[PDB]
Symmetry: C2
Subunit: 95 residues, 2 copies
């Protein structure tokens, strides 16, 4: 199916079973989310320049698909699913 | 046709005949661009909080379509075509 873009494309995803609302952002290369607790097993990352925790091989369910991917958690004003997850979800921009 | 999202979706557009490379950004509500001169007929806008010039009814050609829309010019690190132009161009997110 398709999503029209009149409204900001915010959907609900479950990351490791924890619900979160995210923005499907074609302007972002990576994904960062907050408000969930993925655990002690992460790689500290630095991306202003905030401090994030990188989790790899995480199960995410959104839009009827269940994938495994990488996600970063940290102080972000918006929860965003960037192109690294959009591609793993088989999403494209149509015109 | 469709655009896959492995690469940042940057395309070339002509705005009033002036070439510019823009990012098709689903994370942006509006569009702002720099490096082109659209003229003296604009509405000053404030959107950090930068100062922009809003032009309405501007002819833009991109992706094989020619539309008229609104665009803001001003100091932006990236030239972005937000949802206000993506919808006028008939673009959707497919999955």
């Amino acid at each position: 199916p398709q999503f029209h873009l009149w409204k900001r494309p915010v959907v609900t995803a479950h990351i490791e079973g924890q619900p979160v609302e995210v923005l499907l952002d074609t302007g972002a290369d990576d994904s960062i989310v907050t408000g969930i607790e993925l655990g002690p097993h992460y790689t500290p990352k630095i991306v202003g320049f905030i401090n994030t925790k990188e989790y790899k091989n995480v199960e995410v369910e959104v839009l009827g698909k269940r994938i495994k991917g990488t996600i970063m958690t940290g102080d972000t004003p918006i929860n965003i699913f960037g192109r690294n997850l959009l591609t793993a979800l088989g999403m494209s921009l149509n015109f």
